[PDB]
Design an enzyme around this catalytic site. Structure first.
Site, PDB file in Angstrom:
ATOM      1  N   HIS A 234      -4.549  -8.225  -4.686  1.00  0.00           N
ATOM      2  CA  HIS A 234      -3.315  -7.755  -4.053  1.00  0.00           C
ATOM      3  C   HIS A 234      -3.591  -7.429  -2.586  1.00  0.00           C
ATOM      4  O   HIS A 234      -2.710  -7.550  -1.732  1.00  0.00           O
ATOM      5  CB  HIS A 234      -2.793  -6.490  -4.735  1.00  0.00           C
ATOM      6  CG  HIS A 234      -2.743  -6.653  -6.248  1.00  0.00           C
ATOM      7  ND1 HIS A 234      -2.037  -7.528  -6.987  1.00  0.00           N
ATOM      8  CD2 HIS A 234      -3.528  -5.933  -7.121  1.00  0.00           C
ATOM      9  CE1 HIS A 234      -2.364  -7.377  -8.252  1.00  0.00           C
ATOM     10  NE2 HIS A 234      -3.264  -6.417  -8.315  1.00  0.00           N
TER      11      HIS A 234
ATOM     12  N   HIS B 110      -6.786   0.292   2.581  1.00  0.00           N
ATOM     13  CA  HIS B 110      -6.377  -1.103   2.433  1.00  0.00           C
ATOM     14  C   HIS B 110      -5.312  -1.416   3.454  1.00  0.00           C
ATOM     15  O   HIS B 110      -4.850  -0.531   4.169  1.00  0.00           O
ATOM     16  CB  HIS B 110      -5.783  -1.393   1.059  1.00  0.00           C
ATOM     17  CG  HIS B 110      -4.755  -0.382   0.608  1.00  0.00           C
ATOM     18  ND1 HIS B 110      -5.000   0.753  -0.032  1.00  0.00           N
ATOM     19  CD2 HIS B 110      -3.418  -0.470   0.824  1.00  0.00           C
ATOM     20  CE1 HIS B 110      -3.869   1.366  -0.214  1.00  0.00           C
ATOM     21  NE2 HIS B 110      -2.924   0.621   0.307  1.00  0.00           N
TER      22      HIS B 110
ATOM     23  N   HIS C 186      -1.681  -3.935   4.394  1.00  0.00           N
ATOM     24  CA  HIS C 186      -0.564  -4.764   3.965  1.00  0.00           C
ATOM     25  C   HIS C 186      -0.278  -5.570   5.231  1.00  0.00           C
ATOM     26  O   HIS C 186      -0.299  -4.992   6.333  1.00  0.00           O
ATOM     27  CB  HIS C 186       0.621  -3.859   3.581  1.00  0.00           C
ATOM     28  CG  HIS C 186       0.357  -3.001   2.343  1.00  0.00           C
ATOM     29  ND1 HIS C 186       0.662  -3.292   1.084  1.00  0.00           N
ATOM     30  CD2 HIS C 186      -0.228  -1.755   2.335  1.00  0.00           C
ATOM     31  CE1 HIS C 186       0.300  -2.277   0.327  1.00  0.00           C
ATOM     32  NE2 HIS C 186      -0.232  -1.355   1.084  1.00  0.00           N
TER      33      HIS C 186
ATOM     34  N   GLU D 149       4.933  -1.849   5.787  1.00  0.00           N
ATOM     35  CA  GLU D 149       5.809  -1.454   4.696  1.00  0.00           C
ATOM     36  C   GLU D 149       6.897  -0.488   5.228  1.00  0.00           C
ATOM     37  O   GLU D 149       8.086  -0.617   4.972  1.00  0.00           O
ATOM     38  CB  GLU D 149       4.940  -0.796   3.615  1.00  0.00           C
ATOM     39  CG  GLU D 149       3.951  -1.755   2.988  1.00  0.00           C
ATOM     40  CD  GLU D 149       3.578  -1.382   1.559  1.00  0.00           C
ATOM     41  OE1 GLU D 149       2.958  -0.355   1.307  1.00  0.00           O
ATOM     42  OE2 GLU D 149       3.900  -2.148   0.682  1.00  0.00           O
TER      43      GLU D 149
ATOM     44  N   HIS E 256      -3.374   1.798   5.126  1.00  0.00           N
ATOM     45  CA  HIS E 256      -3.220   3.012   4.370  1.00  0.00           C
ATOM     46  C   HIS E 256      -4.568   3.653   4.056  1.00  0.00           C
ATOM     47  O   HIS E 256      -5.424   3.023   3.432  1.00  0.00           O
ATOM     48  CB  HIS E 256      -2.482   2.720   3.074  1.00  0.00           C
ATOM     49  CG  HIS E 256      -1.028   2.257   3.173  1.00  0.00           C
ATOM     50  ND1 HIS E 256      -0.389   1.457   2.324  1.00  0.00           N
ATOM     51  CD2 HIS E 256      -0.117   2.660   4.109  1.00  0.00           C
ATOM     52  CE1 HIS E 256       0.874   1.374   2.695  1.00  0.00           C
ATOM     53  NE2 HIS E 256       1.016   2.103   3.766  1.00  0.00           N
TER      54      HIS E 256
ATOM     55  N   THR F  45       3.144   2.285  -3.122  1.00  0.00           N
ATOM     56  CA  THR F  45       4.060   1.206  -2.878  1.00  0.00           C
ATOM     57  C   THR F  45       3.778  -0.013  -3.728  1.00  0.00           C
ATOM     58  O   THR F  45       4.415  -1.054  -3.530  1.00  0.00           O
ATOM     59  CB  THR F  45       3.997   0.886  -1.402  1.00  0.00           C
ATOM     60  OG1 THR F  45       2.691   0.407  -1.162  1.00  0.00           O
ATOM     61  CG2 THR F  45       4.296   2.106  -0.507  1.00  0.00           C
TER      62      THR F  45
END
Ligand SMILES: NS(=O)(=O)c1ccc(S(=O)(=O)NCc2cccs2)s1
Ligand SMILES: [Hg+2]
Ligand SMILES: [Zn+2]
Length: 256
Positions: free
Chosen positions: A61, A91, A93, A103, A116, A195
């Site tokens: 992911h 991590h 996104h 996000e 994050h 999230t």
């Protein structure tokens, strides 16, 4: 099971995780004109002086850098928090194009990626008990914009070839997370959730006002990563971000 594609992406998550439709989901749009400046908010205290990273892992992911959290080595205190929160992992996104990927959005503006730094409340003994509590987690969120290279980010970018597919990991010691912080620690804070599934509503979000910039070649490497495991058909790990959720009866306090 879940992921980010048309058939299993965030608009289907509610079927296995009903809380997707809940009252305190993240990310949200931060409307700057409606945020309440609150002068009682103390300054954030980020003590990442004795942080110990151990490995970086592609989990299908995102990639996560994990830290040794068995002692108070890298902690977050102050701000809206009560108590000490330990760093366990960070991590990102990111998007398939530079104009999407964060996000959280600020006045509906999307950034290229979002970092994050995940922390859990030491009051609860381990991460697993902390995700059973309304104030169990604090995630520090940092926006990334494309511009100049962030030098402290390069170390992460070079190892990404080692962990191209789902399940691979590499030892990744001695990484200092302080090189990823902006100059200013001004922030917005609200109560929210994780999230990604299980979407638990355990999180105090602290989203920093100031972005860090990375170059296009640096975010470019993120996009070469894979969702699939080795030997499965390649799907590029791009657009692993959830859309903004309704704020519904929450207010974003601002430290500025
Ligand atoms: N995008 S985000 O920062 O809100 C996160 C998504 C997942 C996170 S976690 O790996 O820390 N917890 C996921 C869990 C593992 C075990 C029980 S819940 S943090
Ligand atoms: Hg919770
Ligand atoms: Zn995240």
């Amino acid at each position: 099971h879940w992921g980010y594609g048309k058939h299993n992406g965030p608009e289907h998550w509610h079927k296995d995780f009903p809380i997707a439709k809940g009252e305190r989901q993240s990310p949200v749009d931060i409307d700057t004109h409606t945020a309440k400046y609150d002068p009682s908010l103390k300054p954030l205290s980020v003590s990442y002086d004795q942080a110990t990273s151990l490995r970086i892992l592609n989990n299908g992911h995102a990639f996560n850098v994990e830290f040794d959290d068995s002692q108070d080595k890298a902690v977050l205190k102050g701000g809206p928090l009560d108590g000490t929160y330990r760093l366990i992992q960070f991590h990102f996104h990111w998007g398939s194009l530079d104009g999407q990927g964060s996000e959280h959005t600020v006045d509906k503006k999307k950034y290229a990626a979002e970092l994050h730094l995940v922390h859990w409340n030491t009051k609860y003994g381990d991460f697993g008990k902390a995700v059973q509590q309304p104030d169990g987690l604090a995630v520090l969120g940092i926006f990334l914009k494309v511009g100049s290279a962030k030098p402290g980010l390069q170390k992460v970018v070079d190892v990404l070839d080692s962990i191209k597919t789902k399940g691979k990991s590499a030892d990744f010691t001695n990484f200092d997370p302080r090189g990823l912080l902006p100059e200013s620690l001004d922030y917005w804070t609200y109560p929210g959730s994780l999230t990604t599934p299980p979407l638990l509503e355990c999180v105090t979000w602290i989203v920093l006002k100031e972005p860090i910039s990375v170059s296009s070649e640096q975010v470019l490497k993120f996009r070469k990563l894979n969702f699939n495991g080795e030997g499965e058909p390649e799907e590029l790990m791009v657009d692993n971000w959830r859309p903004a959720q309704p704020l519904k009866n929450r207010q974003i306090k601002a430290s500025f």
